Short mmCIF file of C-alpha atoms (C1' of nucleotides) and ligand atoms in Angstrom, two decimals:
data_model
loop_
_atom_site.label_atom_id
_atom_site.label_comp_id
_atom_site.label_asym_id
_atom_site.label_seq_id
_atom_site.Cartn_x
_atom_site.Cartn_y
_atom_site.Cartn_z
CA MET A 61 22.88 -19.21 10.42
CA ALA A 62 21.39 -15.62 10.15
CA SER A 63 21.06 -13.48 7.03
CA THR A 64 20.73 -9.70 7.34
CA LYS A 65 19.34 -7.25 5.05
CA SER A 66 22.69 -6.29 3.62
CA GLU A 67 23.86 -9.99 3.27
CA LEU A 68 20.72 -10.29 1.09
CA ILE A 69 20.91 -7.51 -1.06
CA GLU A 70 24.39 -8.59 -1.64
CA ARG A 71 23.14 -12.15 -3.05
CA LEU A 72 20.50 -10.54 -5.18
CA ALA A 73 23.13 -8.08 -6.47
CA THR A 74 25.65 -10.65 -7.61
CA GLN A 75 23.02 -12.37 -9.27
CA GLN A 76 21.77 -9.23 -11.06
CA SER A 77 24.71 -7.85 -12.88
CA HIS A 78 22.91 -6.29 -15.71
CA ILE A 79 21.67 -3.97 -12.94
CA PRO A 80 23.76 -1.64 -10.85
CA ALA A 81 24.29 -2.50 -7.28
CA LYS A 82 23.08 0.92 -5.96
CA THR A 83 19.82 0.13 -7.95
CA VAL A 84 19.63 -3.41 -6.76
CA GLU A 85 19.98 -1.93 -3.28
CA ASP A 86 17.61 0.87 -3.60
CA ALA A 87 14.98 -1.49 -4.80
CA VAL A 88 14.97 -3.81 -1.89
CA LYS A 89 14.65 -0.64 0.73
CA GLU A 90 11.72 0.92 -1.61
CA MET A 91 9.93 -2.67 -1.70
CA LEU A 92 10.32 -2.79 2.22
CA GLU A 93 9.19 0.78 2.50
CA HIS A 94 6.23 0.16 0.29
CA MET A 95 5.42 -2.86 2.01
CA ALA A 96 5.64 -1.45 5.65
CA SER A 97 3.68 1.69 4.19
CA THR A 98 0.99 -0.51 2.86
CA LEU A 99 0.56 -2.10 6.22
CA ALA A 100 0.46 1.06 8.23
CA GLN A 101 -1.31 3.09 5.92
CA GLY A 102 -1.59 1.12 2.59
CA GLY A 103 -4.36 2.99 0.80
CA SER A 104 -3.97 1.17 -2.69
CA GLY A 105 -5.76 -1.95 -1.31
CA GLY A 106 -4.04 -5.16 -1.17
CA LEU A 107 -0.23 -5.02 -2.20
CA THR A 108 0.80 -7.57 -4.80
CA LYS A 109 3.88 -8.48 -6.81
CA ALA A 110 2.83 -6.04 -9.81
CA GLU A 111 2.27 -3.21 -7.53
CA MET A 112 5.72 -3.47 -6.18
CA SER A 113 7.15 -3.77 -9.51
CA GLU A 114 4.95 -0.57 -11.00
CA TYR A 115 6.28 1.38 -7.72
CA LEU A 116 9.88 0.59 -8.46
CA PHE A 117 9.26 1.66 -11.91
CA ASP A 118 7.76 4.89 -10.88
CA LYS A 119 10.01 5.62 -8.01
CA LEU A 120 13.36 4.34 -9.53
CA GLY A 121 12.33 4.65 -13.16
CA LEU A 122 13.66 1.32 -13.36
CA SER A 123 12.57 -0.95 -16.46
CA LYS A 124 9.36 -2.67 -15.62
CA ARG A 125 10.71 -6.02 -16.88
CA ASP A 126 13.80 -5.77 -14.34
CA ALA A 127 11.84 -4.45 -11.56
CA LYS A 128 9.64 -7.76 -11.77
CA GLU A 129 12.58 -10.09 -12.12
CA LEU A 130 14.05 -8.42 -8.83
CA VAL A 131 10.63 -8.56 -6.80
CA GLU A 132 10.42 -12.16 -7.77
CA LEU A 133 14.06 -12.79 -6.97
CA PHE A 134 13.95 -10.60 -3.81
CA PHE A 135 11.33 -13.26 -2.09
CA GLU A 136 13.09 -16.05 -3.68
CA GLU A 137 16.43 -15.43 -2.12
CA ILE A 138 14.72 -15.29 1.41
CA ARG A 139 12.97 -18.47 0.83
CA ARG A 140 16.23 -20.22 -0.38
CA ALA A 141 17.77 -18.75 2.98
CA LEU A 142 15.19 -20.14 5.03
CA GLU A 143 14.96 -23.56 3.32
CA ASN A 144 18.87 -23.85 4.31
CA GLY A 145 17.73 -23.57 7.74
CA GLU A 146 18.91 -20.03 7.82
CA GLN A 147 17.05 -16.93 9.64
CA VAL A 148 16.42 -13.89 7.52
CA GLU A 149 16.72 -10.71 9.78
CA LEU A 150 15.71 -7.39 8.09
CA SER A 151 16.21 -4.33 9.64
CA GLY A 152 13.40 -1.89 10.21
CA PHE A 153 10.85 -4.28 9.13
CA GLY A 154 11.17 -7.95 10.80
CA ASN A 155 12.77 -11.21 11.13
CA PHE A 156 11.90 -14.54 9.55
CA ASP A 157 12.65 -17.30 12.34
CA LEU A 158 12.79 -21.10 11.87
CA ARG A 159 11.17 -23.09 14.55
CA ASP A 160 11.11 -27.26 15.00
CA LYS A 161 7.64 -28.15 16.25
CA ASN A 162 6.98 -31.30 18.01
CA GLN A 163 3.85 -33.26 17.27
CA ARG A 164 0.67 -32.57 19.36
CA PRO A 165 -2.74 -33.47 19.84
CA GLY A 166 -5.09 -32.60 17.00
CA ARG A 167 -8.48 -33.70 15.46
CA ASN A 168 -11.10 -32.85 12.80
CA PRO A 169 -12.92 -29.74 13.77
CA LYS A 170 -15.87 -31.05 12.06
CA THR A 171 -15.93 -34.57 13.07
CA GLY A 172 -13.80 -34.27 16.23
CA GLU A 173 -11.70 -37.41 15.64
CA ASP A 174 -8.44 -37.16 17.36
CA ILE A 175 -5.59 -36.63 14.58
CA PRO A 176 -2.11 -35.69 15.63
CA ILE A 177 -0.28 -32.55 14.42
CA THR A 178 3.12 -34.03 12.96
CA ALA A 179 6.17 -32.59 14.00
CA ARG A 180 7.50 -30.13 11.39
CA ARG A 181 9.54 -26.82 10.94
CA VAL A 182 7.71 -23.73 10.30
CA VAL A 183 8.68 -20.18 9.32
CA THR A 184 7.53 -17.35 11.68
CA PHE A 185 7.66 -13.61 11.08
CA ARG A 186 8.57 -11.22 14.29
CA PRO A 187 7.56 -7.71 13.19
CA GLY A 188 10.45 -5.18 14.54
CA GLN A 189 9.28 -2.43 16.65
CA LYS A 190 10.12 0.25 14.08
CA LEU A 191 7.27 -1.52 12.07
CA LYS A 192 4.97 -2.23 14.75
CA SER A 193 5.04 1.39 15.53
CA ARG A 194 3.82 2.39 12.24
CA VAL A 195 1.14 0.06 12.23
CA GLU A 196 -0.35 1.38 15.58
CA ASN A 197 0.68 4.87 15.01
CA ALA A 198 -0.92 4.88 11.55
CA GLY A 199 -3.90 3.15 12.65
CA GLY A 200 -3.35 -0.03 10.44
CA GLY A 201 -3.79 -0.12 6.61
CA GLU A 202 -4.22 -2.74 3.92
CA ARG A 203 -2.38 -6.39 3.47
CA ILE A 204 0.05 -7.80 1.16
CA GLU A 205 -0.19 -11.24 -0.62
CA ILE A 206 2.72 -12.92 -2.31
CA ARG A 207 1.85 -16.33 -3.49
CA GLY A 208 4.27 -18.86 -2.83
CA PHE A 209 5.91 -16.83 -0.33
CA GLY A 210 3.32 -15.73 2.34
CA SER A 211 0.89 -13.18 3.15
CA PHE A 212 1.19 -10.08 5.60
CA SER A 213 -2.12 -8.82 7.35
CA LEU A 214 -3.09 -6.80 10.35
CA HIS A 215 -4.40 -8.62 13.57
CA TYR A 216 -6.60 -6.54 16.24
CA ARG A 217 -5.61 -6.18 19.78
CA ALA A 218 -8.46 -5.17 22.00
CA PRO A 219 -7.79 -2.58 24.70
CA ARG A 220 -6.60 -4.06 28.12
CA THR A 221 -4.93 -3.00 31.39
CA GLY A 222 -1.16 -4.34 30.94
CA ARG A 223 1.41 -4.41 33.56
CA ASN A 224 4.91 -3.15 33.49
CA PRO A 225 6.66 -6.79 33.65
CA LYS A 226 9.46 -5.02 35.72
CA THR A 227 7.56 -2.90 38.25
CA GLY A 228 4.31 -4.66 38.06
CA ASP A 229 2.55 -1.48 37.74
CA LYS A 230 -0.49 -1.52 35.66
CA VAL A 231 -0.65 0.39 32.39
CA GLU A 232 -3.55 1.58 30.19
CA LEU A 233 -3.31 -0.04 26.73
CA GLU A 234 -5.29 1.11 23.78
CA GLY A 235 -6.56 -1.12 20.80
CA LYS A 236 -4.29 -1.43 18.11
CA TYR A 237 -3.38 -3.26 15.04
CA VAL A 238 -0.16 -5.63 14.76
CA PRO A 239 1.48 -7.08 11.56
CA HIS A 240 0.92 -10.83 10.92
CA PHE A 241 2.54 -13.41 8.35
CA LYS A 242 1.13 -16.65 7.02
CA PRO A 243 3.76 -18.55 5.18
CA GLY A 244 2.75 -19.76 1.64
CA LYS A 245 2.46 -23.43 0.63
CA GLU A 246 5.63 -23.08 -1.41
CA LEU A 247 7.48 -21.85 1.48
CA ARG A 248 6.20 -24.20 4.16
CA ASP A 249 7.13 -27.34 2.13
CA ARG A 250 10.70 -26.19 1.31
CA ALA A 251 11.43 -24.82 4.84
CA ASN A 252 9.68 -27.93 6.60
CA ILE A 253 12.62 -30.43 6.57
CA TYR A 254 10.01 -32.98 7.27
CA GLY A 255 8.18 -33.19 3.78
CA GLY A 256 10.91 -32.90 1.07
CA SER A 257 9.71 -36.45 0.14
CA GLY A 258 6.96 -37.85 -1.67
CA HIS A 259 4.36 -35.06 -1.87
CA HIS A 260 0.81 -35.44 -0.99
CA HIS A 261 -1.42 -35.85 -3.94
CA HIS A 262 -4.69 -38.21 -4.31
CA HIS A 263 -8.12 -37.31 -5.56
CA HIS A 264 -10.26 -39.14 -3.12
"C1'" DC B 122 -2.16 -2.78 -21.49
"C1'" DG B 123 -6.76 -6.10 -21.27
"C1'" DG B 124 -8.90 -10.60 -21.00
"C1'" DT B 125 -8.82 -16.29 -18.77
"C1'" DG B 126 -7.96 -19.93 -15.50
"C1'" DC B 127 -6.66 -22.26 -11.88
"C1'" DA B 128 -3.97 -23.03 -7.65
"C1'" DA B 129 -2.79 -20.49 -3.94
"C1'" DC B 130 -5.58 -17.89 -1.12
"C1'" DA B 131 -9.31 -16.53 3.32
"C1'" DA B 132 -12.57 -18.09 6.28
"C1'" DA B 133 -14.78 -21.57 9.23
"C1'" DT B 134 -15.83 -25.23 12.92
"C1'" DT B 135 -12.69 -27.61 18.50
"C1'" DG B 136 -9.59 -27.91 21.71
"C1'" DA B 137 -4.65 -29.12 23.81
"C1'" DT B 138 -0.24 -26.86 23.20
"C1'" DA B 139 2.90 -23.58 22.10
"C1'" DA B 140 4.47 -18.92 21.41
"C1'" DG B 141 4.06 -13.75 22.36
"C1'" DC B 142 4.06 -9.55 25.51
"C1'" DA B 143 2.57 -5.05 28.47
"C1'" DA B 144 7.67 -0.71 30.20
"C1'" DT B 145 12.35 0.56 29.65
"C1'" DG B 146 17.48 1.08 30.41
"C1'" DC B 147 21.76 -1.23 29.32
"C1'" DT B 148 24.11 -3.72 25.61
"C1'" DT B 149 24.89 -5.09 20.91
"C1'" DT B 150 24.28 -5.43 16.44
"C1'" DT B 151 23.58 -3.07 12.17
"C1'" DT B 152 23.40 0.68 9.07
"C1'" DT B 153 24.22 4.97 7.61
"C1'" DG B 154 27.21 8.48 4.96
"C1'" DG B 155 31.58 10.63 4.14
"C1'" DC B 156 36.46 9.25 2.05
"C1'" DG C 29 34.39 -2.89 -2.82
"C1'" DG C 30 36.60 -1.73 2.18
"C1'" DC C 31 37.41 1.66 6.43
"C1'" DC C 32 35.54 4.36 9.99
"C1'" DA C 33 32.34 7.22 13.49
"C1'" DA C 34 28.18 8.01 14.44
"C1'" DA C 35 23.24 6.91 14.38
"C1'" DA C 36 19.68 3.68 14.50
"C1'" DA C 37 17.75 -0.49 15.28
"C1'" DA C 38 17.63 -4.45 17.34
"C1'" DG C 39 18.68 -7.46 21.48
"C1'" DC C 40 18.68 -8.48 26.08
"C1'" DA C 41 16.55 -8.63 30.75
"C1'" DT C 42 11.75 -11.23 31.16
"C1'" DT C 43 8.97 -10.06 26.29
"C1'" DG D 99 0.90 -14.74 33.97
"C1'" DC D 100 -2.41 -13.57 31.06
"C1'" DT D 101 -3.35 -13.23 25.98
"C1'" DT D 102 -2.66 -14.74 21.03
"C1'" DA D 103 -1.33 -18.19 17.74
"C1'" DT D 104 -0.81 -22.80 16.12
"C1'" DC D 105 -2.63 -26.88 13.80
"C1'" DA D 106 -5.42 -30.96 12.58
"C1'" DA D 107 -9.57 -32.18 7.60
"C1'" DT D 108 -12.63 -30.29 4.41
"C1'" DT D 109 -15.90 -26.99 2.28
"C1'" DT D 110 -17.34 -22.51 0.15
"C1'" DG D 111 -16.08 -18.28 -1.99
"C1'" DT D 112 -12.08 -15.06 -3.39
"C1'" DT D 113 -7.98 -13.61 -5.79
"C1'" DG D 114 -3.00 -13.11 -7.04
"C1'" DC D 115 -0.24 -13.76 -11.38
"C1'" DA D 116 1.28 -16.87 -15.09
"C1'" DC D 117 -0.18 -17.07 -19.43
"C1'" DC D 118 -2.58 -16.19 -23.53
MN1 MN E 344 21.81 -11.26 13.76
MN1 MN E 345 3.32 4.69 -13.10
MN1 MN E 346 20.70 -26.16 0.95
MN1 MN E 347 15.10 -12.63 17.02
MN1 MN E 348 -4.96 -13.70 10.28
MN1 MN E 349 15.65 0.33 20.20
MN1 MN E 350 16.25 -15.84 31.05
MN1 MN E 351 5.79 -17.49 32.74
#
DNA sequence: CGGTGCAACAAATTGATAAGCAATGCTTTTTTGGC
DNA sequence: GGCCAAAAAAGCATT
DNA sequence: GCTTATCAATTTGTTGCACC
């Protein structure tokens, strides 16, 4: 129950024959590189699906039509993996874990009435060191938003005196930014094996 | 390529509970690039 | 596409 | 060990992207 960058590019390939494997492969790499770049430097504002397609077109001369069908598939394969209980691990970027959460005390932040947070399975993103370094080294860039899949943004970490967990020595840590992912609705419902039933849909 | 419409977004409230993390060396997994 | 040695990244420790 | 994130329900304003 673990899908790597390669095992994923393999599934996208076997489902995109009209597209050469080496291309189906370069694409995934370019996307993750565009994504990583966006978060660290960004520049071109928020990254979207149409930005990742245009880039593929520009960088790999790939037809826009196929570039779009891939980007979409790319995120669709990951979703498929996760909902199956599989964790997606992408080298040089980050891993997408699955965690089963037990019910805990909640409430209505507005009213204050105790309303418990049901047990569920949530998807989480763990930024690799490679990527984390870029974000702090670059000084942080823009964000990424892929509807139905999830969003990537940068969170600020104020400076603080930290400890070498081994020696106990203090170390001076500078403020920095770090990547943060928020699963999209479509991904939260498919991944959470506690809601694949009668959906929630009433008007009052 | 350019314009619309709308559900999926971000942000905002409290507060008990869960998850992550500062340095760094050894181990292990993954990828890389030639054949 | 598979084999392989090396390089890179992640993993673990504990994070 | 200390610090950051999770999440509840609901409103207000923004926006990605399917679809003309
Ligand atoms: Mn693994
Ligand atoms: Mn162009
Ligand atoms: Mn299944
Ligand atoms: Mn992991
Ligand atoms: Mn955030
Ligand atoms: Mn490393
Ligand atoms: Mn342990
Ligand atoms: Mn502890």
